[PDB]
Amino acid sequence: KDFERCELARTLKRLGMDGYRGISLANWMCLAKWESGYNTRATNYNAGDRSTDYGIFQINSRYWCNDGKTPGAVNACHLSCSALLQDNIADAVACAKRVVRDPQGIRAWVAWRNRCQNRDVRQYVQGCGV
């Protein structure tokens, strides 16, 4: 599904993302916007290292989930990558939390560095009541 901006902001808040490991909801929103346009079914194949990015946060199969077809990959979220393509984003949120528990934090995603870091992100949650 395609989430509407405020619908997603509330869903993420209910799932405990606001301020998770110091990351504001506005940052998570900006990340989802730029990674998938708030679409849960998005997938991106990286022909270079034979990995695939999955779901609303475009979480990568080399490290985070198992799709059985990425050479020498690991599964740090201990989930089938299929779990990251659900309309219900609970599992995807649990995995994104796992990603940020690592040292890089939100910087793990290059898109965040490109479109969200050192930029005004307040616009992503304005008027959503979060």
- Catalytic member of 7, 53, 91, 102: 53
Tokens of 127: 């008027």
Q: Which fold has domain 1-130?
A: Lysozyme (1.10.530)
Tokens of 8: 């997603």
Active site residue 7: no
**C-beta neighbour count of 27 within 10 angstroms:** 22
- CA–CA distances in Å: residue 1 to residues 35, 91, 101: 15, 15, 27
- CA–CA distances in Å: residue 38 to residues 48, 49, 55: 25, 25, 9
- CA–CA distances in Å: residue 109 to residues 6, 40, 68, 99: 22, 17, 22, 9
Method: X-ray
- Catalytic member of 4, 7, 18, 35: 35
Interior CA angle at 26 toward 63 and 103, to 5°? 35
> To one decimal place, what's the resolution in Å?
1.8
Residue 51: DSSP 8-state = E
Q: Domain coordinates of the chain in residue numbers?
A: 1-130
- Three-state secondary-structure class, residue 118: coil
Active site residue 35: yes
Report the alpha-carbon distance of residue 115 to residue 68 in Å, rounded.
Answer: 31
